[PDB]
């Protein structure tokens, strides 16, 4: 089964990736509503998910380059504001928001 | 409990910081079953969340609880040199006390 754990400190996606990979896990990528809720359970605040549209704008993939199926975008998202928002966070209501990969948020790691 | 191993080596203070960052702790086997599980996730010698830093030869977990189950390698713990107050799980599953300043892999434990 997948197990999700939340970080205590906030950091940009690249550091979030490094943190989860340090324990041989990955940044949490919910594949369905059950997993999305499981991530909500552990994230006490806005937290990074392992999804990006860095390759092609508006084509969201997990960190292994696998195009995602399930999405739970907050109304109005993804909006790619300004210079670009190519990373994704799980808001406190469980919905998603695309944000700059360089911005800092808690991270939820996934292990199985 | 879920056990995960790090890929890089680091001293105990950094190991504690890593496990704590994801709200866990350095793995502390409470019986032979947990000891084997940690051994299996660790690909090389790794730190356990046990030390005798507070009182020499009184081994406790990182929350101050004295440990009951132990699996010391023959001749251990020997507190050699200027002192060894940290503990590692060897590749055969037995334990060895080592300097906390030394670098080893870390196995984190989560509930
Ligand atoms: O709504 C927007 O609010 C901004 C503050 C920023 O969070 C964007 O990512 C959101 O789409
Ligand atoms: O045996 C000893 O070997 C030393 C190299 C060091 O590892 C000590 O902690 C052990 O007890
Ligand atoms: Ca984008
Ligand atoms: Ca947005
Ligand atoms: Ca000692
Ligand atoms: Ca020793
Ligand atoms: Cl020491």
Curated annotation (Swiss-Prot), chain A:
TM spans (from-to): none
Domain C-type lectin: start-end pairs: 1-110
Disulphide-bonded residues: 20-109, 87-101
Localization of this protein: Secreted
Superkingdom of this protein's organism: Eukaryota
Subunit-structure text: Oligomeric complex of 3 or more homotrimers. Interacts with MASP1 and MASP2. Interacts with MEP1A and MEP1B and may inhibit their catalytic activity.
Comment text on domains: The coiled-coil domain mediates trimerization.
Function noted in UniProt: Calcium-dependent lectin involved in innate immune defense. Binds mannose, fucose and N-acetylglucosamine on different microorganisms and activates the lectin complement pathway. Binds to late apoptotic cells, as well as to apoptotic blebs and to necrotic cells, but not to early apoptotic cells, facilitating their uptake by macrophages.
Record's protein name: Mannose-binding protein C
First and last residues shown, out of full length: 132 to 243 of 244
């Amino acid at each position: 089964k997948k197990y999700f754990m939340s970080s205590v400190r906030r950091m940009p996606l690249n550091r979030a990736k490094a943190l989860c990979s340090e324990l041989q896990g990955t940044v949490a990528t919910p594949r369905n509503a059950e997993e999305n809720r499981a991530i909500q359970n552990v994230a006490k605040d806005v937290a990074f998910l392992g999804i990006t549209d860095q390759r092609t704008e508006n084509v969201f993939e997990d960190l292994t380059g696998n195009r995602v199926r399930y999405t739970n975008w907050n109304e109005g998202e993804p909006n790619n504001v300004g210079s670009g928002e190519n990373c994704v966070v799980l808001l406190t209501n469980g919905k998603w928001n695309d944000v700059p990969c360089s911005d800092s948020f808690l991270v939820v790691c996934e292990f199985s």
